[PDB]
Design a protein around this ligand. Structure first.
Ligand SMILES: NC(=O)c1ccc[n+]([C@@H]2O[C@H](COP(=O)([O-])OP(=O)(O)OC[C@H]3O[C@@H](n4cnc5c(N)ncnc54)[C@H](O)[C@@H]3O)[C@@H](O)[C@H]2O)c1
Length: 162
């Protein structure tokens, strides 16, 4: 403890708190960023990750994109951790505002499985406007590695913890 949490299965623990704070706690982990195709970290969790790095994350992201072009929806890229974690896995969830289908979360969450310990927000559950329950279902269905799923909204936590 130290945070409110529910163990869902052998792999997944749901945590009420801040993903950055949970990632700092763990000696070894990857932190997941809920990113857009251009890795422009203007807001949401992406914004808070970038600011916690003092803009180091945006700097790196720009270099990656500048040289490699935009990601596809459902793609991910493992980049440096900038002291927040061992590395940051930037994952591009579907944006329901752009009629992108929630089923692309399968690709997002499968990318977790090659990592030993993952700390993640619910992908697409913010401004990308996927039902948190739907995002969580896709996570449980596809994630097979040790994962701390961190939500900062107690009402969302209660819904998913039932
Ligand atoms: N031009 C641009 O900058 C541009 C354009 C289009 C889209 N977008 C991006 O789309 C992104 C992704 O949307 P999304 O829904 O996948 O992301 P998200 O940040 O919006 O939401 C993910 C979930 O995690 C929660 N959360 C937020 N901060 C948290 C924290 N500290 N710890 C744990 N949980 C936290 C949110 O409340 C939400 O439930 C935006 O953050 C933004 O970067 C940006």
């Amino acid at each position: 403890s130290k945070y409110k949490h529910t163990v869902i299965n052998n792999s997944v623990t749901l945590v009420l708190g801040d993903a950055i704070q949970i990632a700092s706690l763990l000696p070894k982990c990857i932190l997941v960023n809920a990113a857009n195709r251009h890795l422009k970290h203007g807001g949401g969790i992406a914004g808070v990750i970038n600011k916690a790095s003092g803009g180091d994350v945006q700097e790196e992201s720009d270099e990656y994109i500048s040289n490699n072009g935009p990601l596809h929806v459902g793609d991910s890229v493992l980049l440096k951790g900038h002291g927040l974690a061992d590395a940051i896995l930037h994952v591009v969830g579907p944006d329901a505002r752009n009629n992108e289908d929630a089923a692309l979360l399968k690709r997002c969450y499968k990318a977790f499985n090659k990592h030993t310990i993952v700390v993640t927000p619910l992908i697409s559950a913010g401004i990308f406007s996927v039902d948190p329950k739907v995002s969580f279902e896709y996570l449980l269905a596809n994630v097979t590695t040790t994962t701390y799923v961190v939500v900062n909204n107690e009402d969302i936590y209660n819904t998913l913890a039932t």
